[PDB]
Design a protein around this ligand. Structure first.
Ligand code: HEM
Ligand code: HEM
Ligand code: HEM
Ligand SMILES: [K+]
Ligand SMILES: [K+]
Lengths: 154, 154, 155, 154, 154, 154, 154
């Protein structure tokens, strides 16, 4: 395995580990508040990050690197729905920047299989960004109280 | 059967008999107002207290005590949705306080089967407290009118 | 919206149902405790039937814009053995039916025909309970107490 | 594994071994006499004691103790139905006293899983005591001859 | 019922009671060690002995004897698989010797039904001897480590 | 919500978060090596810890504490099967010690629902300790090469 | 169709033709030795190379090139399991080297559909490399004789 590919893959892994925990706690906060539709959506977002972490771990091991599950960076935890959505969005904008940097390097060293894994993760993160921007926009269009009302029941 | 255990069990049963009637009336009031989702939920809370009452009666009889279904304490009847939910919450905080006291005494006299029964009731009353706190929080987050609207239809 | 005295009558019938619910639920669990499971099961169904009658009275009182009274619980008639328990249920039902007839009279007088119909349905069911109770007491005499109890051991 | 917990568990195991044999014999005596409903019921009680003994043996071995299946205490065999039911009841009153002492001890040394195993056995033995006292009461209520009649057919 | 027949049936029954407990403990020992295939087979041998005991108890009662479930002989408990297997084998060789003597005596006094019962028990114990000798032979042919490995999984 | 209960629950949650990542990495290491039976079992151990962590987060929120998903303690990563099993066992021994201390405190302040939650986690960790010790015992009884051989296929 | 793209595709097709025959012969050698699990796995590796050749042949025709099925390079045939696995691995390392050079060129001349086809082949060859290095590592971990024993049966 190329050394900087492994480094990049461990950096993406690191970002996924932050997002697993952030989304899981956000899901459980939403469920606690009785906003069960947000909580369920955010739970599935956490599970998707878990699956990506799994694929990254497996690839790092095949390339004979050491997956780093020890370093957990800063969780962005909001205190209300609007903040939590914006925190998830801030995290995803950092995650896609790093994914693009990793894909650029993979292409340069001809690691096309790693590039393809990272591109699939990127597509999934951009769909999350689409979801988050749509939610923030809906809060503006229907108002916050209606937007929360619409997320009470699954 | 330990005399004080029978006394605590009859105290818990007295609490259940209040909650049966309070929840049933609150249920039928919400149904009458067309808030059928609140009515259905509160109906199931009444049924669950009927089941706990039944388990308490069976245990008191096995311990050779006299179940007391004669003394009905004070019902806390609200006159609107907010008051009714806070009356249920006030009832449950007293119920759990008495359950903790019954559990301590069961342990002290080695009545572990009565303790286990009481702990199962306690877990179910904590779940009701959780629901009730959540509803009061949703009234604040979505507004009362939206909250009621969301409880019109089952 | 409703007639005030109709509501008072319906709250009085409701009060009788709330006694019956508790009395029959306790008798049922006493019979189960003693191993007389067929009696226990029948009495449990009588208790459930009174619960449903109470539900219909509560719903009708609310519709009529009265306040259902679930706070006042009158005197439970609890027996010490099977024969007393059956007589206690019978004593309760005889009072219940007297009050039903008085409430039906009043509904009729003020033209509350839907309330009268609800109360007649309750009365039919309570008379069926009286038939059951009188029949059991008669069977205790015909087959003897020990055989009667024996026949109610198994469901 | 706590040495005194293991001694308590072997003590309870010893009682179960007595009960297995006592109830199995009582079952086959009732079947021999044609009281097939008593015989079937007592067979199931014996089977339940066999399952408790299994769980005790598995727990003792996990705690690194030696399960004692060698010491068989005194079986209380009756000569007729009324004595047999009282022998079973005498055995269970001794059995539940030992269980309560064992639970106290497991609780103090923080062996909460052992305590939970013993609590499940205790609930089962209290159910047996309920059955036993109910049968003795029924003999008084319906008369011995009717009582036995009712236990001829399964 | 012939007095010595009944003595022989209580002797065989006494042997069954030892085997029940020995095999049951050996089963749970094997399970505790993760040799689940040995544990499962030895559990089924214990159950088989339980069923023989039941048939003996029933026959003793019909003959108007007193089944003796009080006297529990010495359990032969091994410390490892080879010893446990040899212990079972030693117990069975004693059991079949006793069964042959009982059959001789039943034939002598013309209790042909008891003889037939004992013969069916004998056939089953000889099948257990077959299994045990085959296992000890396999340890020799495949080696102990392989033999144990082959009994890890059910 | 009692402040020290919440501290205990967050300490147990910290333990779960370590175990999730340690077991997940060990699972994927074993899969990478072709020891797919070990990899599958360790995956399920990790998912089980994830589920425990979920329940802790929900209880901490209901008690109006802040769940700590930010602090990740030291993963104990082995470099061969024997060491990985021992690292799992060391983690589980610390985990159960902390569970017992939390259960004591819950009992002390009468938080019987938290204690019940903790006791179910404790039973699950003790089953894991049972598995781990059995595996280490098997390596000694069948030899390391046979033990690994038996864990190649699912 | 770009002339050098066609030449690269014909080079990869040449590598697939070697792999087809080498893996097929290895498969039947393993079957002949009674190592049916290896022979079954290697048969499926051969089929996969057959399917890759088919996709290459189709793409070359579409680009108006001449598929070259005439030139068969050097088969690497081993004479025991360890050698056959290392021969497969040597062939795959060469194959993946050529695939990367082919993809680089497709990207330069903007033949993204050919690049897509080769990247899919490349991922499949890296999975085969994963398998081969895993098998070689298992031979070391469980020993040759156990490794081969584990591959006698399908
Ligand atoms: C105001 C007093 C009560 C009312 C209005 C009431 C009402 C009801 C109703 C409407 C049902 C559903 C029955 C059906 O449709 O099958 C029910 C069920 C039941 N009730 Fe009550 N009830 C009352 C008091 C009690 C009390 C004091 C007990 C004592 C244990 C009790 C025990 C039960 C039980 C065990 C069931 C069956 C629940 C189940 O397992 O699904 N009820 N009740
Ligand atoms: C007098 C001695 C015993 C007798 C006569 C006896 C009899 C029986 C019988 C007749 C069965 C049902 C077998 C079948 O048809 O499947 C059985 C099952 C069983 N026995 Fe025993 N048994 C004895 C002692 C024991 C002992 C000491 C243990 C130790 C645990 C034990 C454990 C079990 C278990 C676990 C079952 C399966 C129960 C189930 O899950 O259905 N038995 N026994
Ligand atoms: C706070 C940490 C985590 C929590 C609370 C958590 C929680 C969960 C839960 C509740 C499930 C569903 C389990 C079920 O009911 O079957 C799950 C699934 C899963 N988790 Fe995690 N998890 C966490 C961390 C991780 C990490 C770090 C990874 C991988 C590196 C991971 C990988 C997975 C995988 C692969 C699944 C199965 C997903 C699927 O295919 O459905 N999880 N997790
Ligand atoms: K009779
Ligand atoms: K082997």
């Amino acid at each position: 395995g190329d050394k900087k590919v492994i480094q990049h893959l461990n950096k993406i892994l690191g970002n996924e580990l932050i997002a697993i925990n952030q989304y899981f706690l956000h899901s459980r906060m939403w469920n606690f508040w009785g906003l069960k539709r947000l909580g369920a959506h955010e739970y599935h977002e956490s599970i998707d990050e878990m699956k990506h972490a799994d694929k990254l771990i497996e690839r790092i091991l095949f390339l004979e690197g050491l997956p780093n599950l020890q370093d957990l960076g800063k969780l962005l935890i909001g205190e209300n729905t609007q903040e939590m959505l914006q925190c998830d969005l801030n995290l995803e904008l950092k995650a896609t920047k790093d994914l693009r940097e990793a894909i650029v390097h993979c292409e340069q060293v001809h690691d096309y299989v790693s590039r393809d894994l990272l591109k699939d993760i990127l597509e999934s993160e951009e769909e999350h960004i689409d979801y988050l921007e749509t939610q923030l926009g809906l809060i503006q269009k229907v108002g916050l109280e209606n937007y929360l009302q619409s997320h009470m029941h699954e």
